[PDB]
Amino acid sequence: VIKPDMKIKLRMEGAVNGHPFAIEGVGLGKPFEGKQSMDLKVKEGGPLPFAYDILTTVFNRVFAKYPENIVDYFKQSFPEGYSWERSMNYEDGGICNATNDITLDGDCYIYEIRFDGVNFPANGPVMQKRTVKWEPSTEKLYVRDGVLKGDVNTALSLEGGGHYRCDFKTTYKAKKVVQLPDYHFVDHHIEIKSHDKDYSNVNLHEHAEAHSGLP
Amino acid sequence: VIKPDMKIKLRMEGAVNGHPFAIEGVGLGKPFEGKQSMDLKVKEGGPLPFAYDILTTVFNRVFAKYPENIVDYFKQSFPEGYSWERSMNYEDGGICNATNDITLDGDCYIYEIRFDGVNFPANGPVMQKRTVKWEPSTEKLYVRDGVLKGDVNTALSLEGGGHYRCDFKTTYKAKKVVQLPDYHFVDHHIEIKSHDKDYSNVNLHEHAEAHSGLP
Amino acid sequence: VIKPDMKIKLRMEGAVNGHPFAIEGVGLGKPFEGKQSMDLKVKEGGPLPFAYDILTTVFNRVFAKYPENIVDYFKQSFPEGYSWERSMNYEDGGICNATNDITLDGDCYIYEIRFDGVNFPANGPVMQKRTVKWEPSTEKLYVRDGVLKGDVNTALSLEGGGHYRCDFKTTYKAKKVVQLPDYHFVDHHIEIKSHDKDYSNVNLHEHAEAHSGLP
Amino acid sequence: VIKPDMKIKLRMEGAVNGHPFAIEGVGLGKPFEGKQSMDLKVKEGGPLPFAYDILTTVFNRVFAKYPENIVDYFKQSFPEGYSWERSMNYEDGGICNATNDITLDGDCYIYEIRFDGVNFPANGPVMQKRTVKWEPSTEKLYVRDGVLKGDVNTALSLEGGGHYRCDFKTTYKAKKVVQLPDYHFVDHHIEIKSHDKDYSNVNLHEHAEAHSGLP
C-alpha cells in the first residue's frame, strides 16, 4: 500500500489576518527514505502579503524514515489514510491553525488543507517577510487519549540575524485502528529550494527521519 | 451614522477539528446601552458535534456602553467599519482562530465571520458538550502599534461543576483613522437565552459596558 | 477576629536573575474597605537593579471589600490564616515565582515571602527600569479541585508609553477548612505613592473590592 | 582548565509550594564525553513531598560532547565559569524557577543552586509522585541579544503510561566574554539510576551530545 516512489496532490484554502488565499501543489517523495519534493502555485489571493515560510510546514509524516524498532503510525494508516490538526504558536502572538485530511488514490497522496493565521502584527517578520528559513528541527511524538500527538518547538532564522520562535502542537488521527508507537522523535529539515520573486511559484523540500534519542 | 436601534446580519463559515459548518444570524441591539440580541441558524454541518459556547463570543464591541470619558474606538470607525482577529486558547490545548469583517449597510451591521478550532480532544468538555455558559468577564483593552488590542481571560462553567478556562487575544483594526483610547476595560456578559435540542436555532444575548477600573 | 484597623509586618527574601536581595515592610489597612498602605525598606541587595514594580503585587487578599452575597474566603481563614503561591508570567519570558505565608499576631498580619524571578532580558523594561506603574486590574477567583484560584491578566505602563503584559496565577490555601466561594472577581489598583531615588524606601498602597461582574 | 575527568560539588536551596528544602551533592564526569554522575543527599525539608524528578535537570552543559564544527560556549567560558537561569513550565501550570552559579576550583565544578516551584496541584503527578523518568530530549541553543539561550520541551513518563509535558527556557551567561555558537542542538538523557525509598539518597546520571540536526 506504500510504494518506494509516491506522488502528492494538494490544495490549500486559507486566510492570514483576514486575507483569503489558495495554493495548489503537485509533488513526489519516497516515504521509506523520509524525503519529498513539491512545486506550489498560488491560485487565489496573490501576491501573498505574508512570509511564505509560515505555510511550508503545512505543505505528511508518511515522508519520514522510520527505523524497524519504532512503530510507524503513518504508514500503518494507509490505504485509508489519516488526518491531522495543528496549532502553530509564534512567540509574538501570531497563531496559525491548520488541518490536513490525507487520502490515497493509487500512488498519489491527496491533501485537503485549511490554514488560518491571525494576530500577526504589521511590524512583524511575517507581515514584513523578514524570514529566511526554518531551522532543522526535532519533533516529539507521544500517545495521548488513544491518538498520536506531535510537539515541536522550532524557530525561523531572520533577515538581520536572530531567530523567530514557534511552538507546534499536532494531533494525528488515523482513520482505522493502527498500532500506537512509543515515545519517539522525528528530525525534520524543510527548505524552500527555489521560488519566483513574489512566491507564486515555490519549490519546497523536506527530509525527515525517526529516532529514539541519544543512543 | 449611528442610532440607538441597529440591526445585525452575519454569516459564519468555519470548522472544528477539520469538521466544517456554517451558521447565519439576524439580530438587533442598542449600541449606546451595550445590549444586543440575535437569532442564529445552522445551515451546513448540522447537527454541530461541538459545544456551541465556543462560537457565541465570535457572534462586535460597538455594542458596549462607553462613557464619555473613554474614547470609543468602535463607534468612531463607522460607517466604514472595522475588522477584528482573535485567538482563543483553551487550557486543554484547544485553539480557535476567528476573524470578523464588520461593515455598515444603513442601520444594519454586516459580519463576515471565519472560525477555525483545532486540537479539541475527544474526551474534552467541548467535544463532549459539557459546557454550560460563559462566565461574566472583564476585557482589558490597550493600544499597540497604532491598533487597539483586546485581552480577556475567562472560563466556561462545566456540567458537573468547575470551570474550563480560555484566553482571548483580539486585535481591533479600524478601517479609517480614528482616535486611540487609553488603557480601559469592558465588562461582558454573554448568554444563550434559548436553543433547541441540537442547537440548530440559538437566541443569543450580550451585555457590555466600558469602564476605567477601580476609581 | 479581624478588626477594622489592622497592621502589617513582612519580610521578603528573594532573587531576580540569580542576584539575591531582601526587603522588610510595615503597614496598615482596613480589611472591610479593601484598602492598605505600607512602607518598605531594602535590607539586602540594594540598590535594586530591577524594576521595583515587579515586587509590589507580592507585598493579602484579606484587604478586599467583600459584598454580603460573595463568600469571603480570606477573612474567614483567620485567626488561623492562609498561604498563597503565584506565578507571574511576563510576555517577554520573564517569570517571577512568589509565596506568602500569612499569620496573625493579635492585630498584625505577618508575611513570610519568597520571590524568585528569572530570564529577565538585559534590554527589557524590567532590567532597564522603564516601568511606570501597574494598571488597574480585575482578578477572577474560582475553585478548582477544592482550592481557591486567582487569575488576573494585567500590564505595566512603560515610560515612553506602552504596556508590558503579565499573567498572574495564584493559588490560595487556607490553613483550616473554610467555605469556598462561587466564581467572582476582585478589582485591584496598586500604586507606589512615594519612593526615593534607588527605591530603598517605598510607600505602597492598594485598593481592592470584590464583585460579581455585569451588572 | 578542562581535564578528561572533573569532579562536581553542589548545594541546592529551594522550596516547592512554599515548603523549603536543601540538597547537596558530589559527583564526577567527563566533559568531552557529555556524561556525568553524582550522588545527592537531602539535608533539609526531608522527606520530600514532591516528585524528585522535577529537580534532576537542575542538578551543567559543560558535560556535553561538542563536535569541532560547533562552538563550545560552556567549555570556552572556563576557568571564569558561567551562570544559568531557567523556567520549567509544566503543562498543568506547575512552574519551577531555578538558577545555578557555576565556578571552578582546580578540577571541581561548584554549583550554587536556587530552586522554586509553585502551583503544583495536590492531585497532580508531582505532588502524588506518579512520575517515572524524564524522556530523552533534544535541546535547541540559539543566540538572542548577545546571550546564549536554550529551549527544550520534554515530558516525564508517568506511572501506568502517559506523559507530563514541560517547557524549559534557559538563559546561559558566561561571566567572561566568549564566542557565541550558531543555532545547534544538544541531545539529553537523564536517569535516576538508584535511590532509597524517600529519595534521601539519589545517584543521578546524564548523557549529552551536541549536533546540528538533519543536514
Alpha carbon D156 to its chain centroid, in Å, reads 14
Residues C1, C6, C7, C10, CA torsion sign: positive
Phi/psi-derived region of residue A31, left when phi > 0, alpha when psi is between -120 and 50, beta in every other case? alpha
What is the chain C residue with the closest CA to B141?
C154
**C31 phi and psi angles, rounded to 5 deg:** -55, -40
Which residues, other chains included, contact C139 with Cβ-Cβ below 8 Å and sequence gap of 6+?
C150, C151, C152, C168, C170, C185, C186, C187, C188
CA distance D172 to D149: 6
Peptide bond just before D4 cis, omega within 30 deg: no
Q: What residues does C48 pair with on adjacent strands?
A: none
Q: Kindly report the three-state secondary structure assignment for every residue of chain A.
A: CCCCCEEEEEEEEEEECCEEEEEEEEEEEEHHHCEEEEEEEEEECCCCCCCCHHHHCCCCCCCCECCCCCCCCCCCCCCCCEEEEEEEEECCCCEEEEEEEEEEECCEEEEEEEEEEECCCCCCCCCCCCEEEECCEEEEEEEECCEEEEEEEEEEEECCCCEEEEEEEEEEEECCCCCCCCCEEEEEEEEEEEECCCCCEEEEEEEEEEECCCC
CA distances, A14 to each of A48, A57, A61, B96, C113 (Å)? 12, 14, 21, 14, 50
For chain C, the residue count is: 215
- Of B186, B188, B199, B170, the residue nearest B53 (C-alpha): B199
Contact between residue C175 and residue C77 where contact means Cβ atoms under 8 Å apart: yes
CA distances (Å), origin C113, targets B161, B179, C25, D18, D19: 33, 43, 11, 9, 12
- Three-state DSSP state, D70: coil
Instruction: Assess A167–D contact: CB distance below 8 Å, yes or no.
Output: yes
Residues in chain A, overall count: 215
CB-based contact A87 B118, cutoff 8 Å: yes
Q: Which residue is it, cell 454550560?
A: B132
Q: Whole-angstrom Cα distance, residue A185 to residue A138? A: 6
Number of C-beta neighbours around residue B178 at 10 A: 18
Is any Cβ of chain D less than 8 angstroms from the Cβ of C177? no
Relative to beta strand C201-211, strand B82-90 is unpaired
Indicate the burial class of D131 (C-beta count within 10 angstroms; 0-12, 13-18, 19 or more): buried
Q: Which helix (H) or strand (E) holds D54?
A: helix D53-56
In angstroms, the CA A49 to CA C18 distance is: 43
Cα separation, B56 vs B206, in Å, equals 9
Answer for the pair D23, D125: CB distance below 8 angstroms, yes or no.
no
Cell numbers given for B188: 461582558
CA-to-CA distance for C10 and B150, rounded, in angstroms? 36
Q: Please answer whether residues A99 and B15 qualify as being in contact, where contact means their C-beta atoms are separated by less than 8 angstroms.
A: yes
Number of C–D residue contacts, CB under 8 Å: 79
DSSP C68-84: TTS--TTGGGTTT-EEE
Distances (CA, A) of C158 to B170, C129, C162, D156: 21, 9, 5, 39
Residue reference for cell 470607525 = B77
Q: Between chains, do C162 and B183 touch, taking CB under 8 Å as contact?
A: no
Give CA separation, C162 vs A124, B142, B186, B214, in Å.
17, 8, 19, 20
Contact at 8 Å (CB) between D112 and D11? yes
C103 Cβ under 8 Å from any chain D Cβ? no
CB A30 within 8 A of CB A8: no
* Residue showing cell 443569543: B204
Cell (9 digits) for A147: 491518538
Extract the C-alpha cell encoding D72: 563550545
CB atoms within 10 A of CB C168: 20
D75 phi/psi in degrees, rounded to 5? -70, -25
User: Do residues A31 and A2 make contact, with C-beta atoms less than 8 angstroms apart?
Assistant: yes
Q: Would you say B181 and B70 are in contact if contact means Cβ atoms under 8 Å apart?
A: yes
Q: Are A181 and A74 in contact (CB under 8 A)?
A: no
Q: Decide if C163 touches B, using CB distance below 8 A.
A: yes
**Residue of A66, A31, A64, A32 whose CA lies nearest to A212:** A66
Half-sphere exposure of B210 (CA within 13 A, CB side): 24
Resolution of the experimental structure, in angstroms: 2.2
Cβ-based neighbours of D3, under 8 Å, separated by 6 or more: D107
CA triplet D29, D35, D41: central angle to 5 degrees? 60
All cell numbers assigned to A73:
503510525
Reduced to 3 states (helix: H, G, I; strand: E, B; else coil), residue B19 is strand
In chain D, residues preceding a discontinuity (C to N beyond 2.5 A) are 59
Q: Where are the beta strands (DSSP E) in chain C?
A: 6-16, 19-30, 35-44, 82-90, 95-105, 108-118, 131-134, 137-144, 147-158, 163-174, 184-195, 201-211
How many Å apart are CA D18 and CA D16, to the nearest integer?
5
Q: Are the C-beta atoms of residues C157 and C130 closer than 8 Å to each other?
A: no
Lookup: cell for B117: 478550532
Which one-letter DSSP state was computed for residue B182?
-
C-alpha cell at A47: 501576491
Q: What's the CA gap between A200 and B97, in Å, rounded?
A: 25
Q: Is A205 annotated as a binding residue?
A: yes
User: Does the distance separating the beta carbons of C116 and D97 come in below 8 Å?
Assistant: yes
DSSP of D121-153: -TTSTTTTT-EEEEPPEEEEEEEETTEEEEEEE
Q: Is C31 helix (H, G, I), strand (E, B) or coil?
A: helix
What is the C-alpha to C-alpha distance for residues D39 and D41, in angstroms, rounded to an integer? Answer: 7
In single-letter form, the type of residue at position D40 comes to L
d(CA C111, CA C61): 12
CA R_g for chain A: 17
Is C100 within 8 Å of C113 (Cβ atoms)? yes
Whether the upstream peptide bond of residue C47 has omega within 30° of 0, thus cis, is yes
CA-nearest of C200, C213, C214 to C39 is C200
Helix, strand, or coil here: D71? coil
Known binding-site residues of D equal 195, 205, 207
Inform me whether the C-beta atom of residue D140 falls under 8 Å from chain A C-beta atoms: yes
Give which of D35, D36, D65, D140 to mutate to test A binding, by max A Cβ within 10 Å.
D140
Going by DSSP bridges, is the β-strand pair B108-118/B131-134 parallel, antiparallel, or unpaired? unpaired
Residue type, A145: D
Yes or no: say if C36 and C27 are a contact pair by the CB < 8 Å rule: yes
- Which CA distances in Å does C114 have to C87, C100, C188? 12, 7, 22
Residues D31 and D7: their CA atoms lie apart, in Å, by: 10
Are A36 and A63 in contact by the 8 Å Cβ rule? The answer is yes
Q: Which three three-digit cell numbers place residue A161?
A: 540575524
Structure-solving method: X-ray
In angstroms and rounded to an integer, the radius of gyration of the C-alpha atoms of chain D is 17
Distance between terminal CA atoms of chain A?
31
Block residue for cell numbers 485509508: A80
Which DSSP string corresponds to D162-180? -EEEEEEEEEEEESS----
Residues 6+ apart with CB under 8 A from B101: A18, B81, B83, B111, B112
- Least Cα distance to C189 among C119, C137, C121 occurs for C137
Which residues lie across from A195 on neighbouring strands? A202
What is the grid cell recorded at D42?
A: 537531602
- Interface contact B137, partner C, CB < 8 A: yes
> For chain B, how many residues are written?
215
Residue C140 contacts residue C39 (beta carbons within 8 Å): no
**C19: how many CB neighbours lie within 10 A of its CB?**
15
Chains adjacent to D (≥3 CB pairs closer than 8 angstroms):
A, C
Read off φ and ψ for residue C54, nearest 5 degrees. -65, -15
* C-beta atoms of D140 and A153 within 8 A: yes
Smallest CA-to-CA distance from D195 within D10, D55, D6 is with: D55
Gap between the Cα atoms of C161 and B209, Å rounded: 25
Q: Which three cell numbers stand for residue A186?
A: 522525528
Q: Residue D188 and residue A162: Cβ atoms within 8 Å?
A: no
In angstroms, the CA B81 to CA B174 distance is: 7
How many Cα atoms occupy the beta-carbon half-sphere of D52 within 13 Å? Answer: 27
Please name every residue paired with D78 in a beta bridge, in sequence order, or none if there are none: none
Q: How far is Cα A82 from Cα C42, in angstroms, rounded to an integer?
A: 61
**Contact indicator for C173, C15 with CB cutoff of 8 Å:** no
Other C-beta atoms lying within 10 Å of the C-beta of residue A26: 13
Inter-residue contact B9 to B109 (CB < 8 Å): yes
Whole-angstrom distance, CA of residue D76 vs CA of residue D79: 9
Pairing of strands D108-118, B95-105: unpaired
Distance from CA of C186 to the nearest CA of B (A): 10
> What is the CB neighbour count within 10 angstroms for residue C57?
21
Provide, as residue numbers in chain A, all residues whose Cβ is less than 8 Å from the Cβ of D187.
213-214
CB-based contact, D98 to chain C, within 8 Å:
yes
d(CA B40, CA B49): 16
C-alpha cell at D101: 552559579
For domain C1-215, give the CATH number: 2.40.155.10
Q: Which cell goes with A126?
A: 511575517
The C-alpha cell that represents D52 in the structure block: 524528585
CA atoms of A8 and A83, how far apart (whole Å): 15
Rounded CA-CA distance C201/D14 in Å is: 28
Q: Are B76 and B174 a contacting pair, CB within 8 Å? A: yes
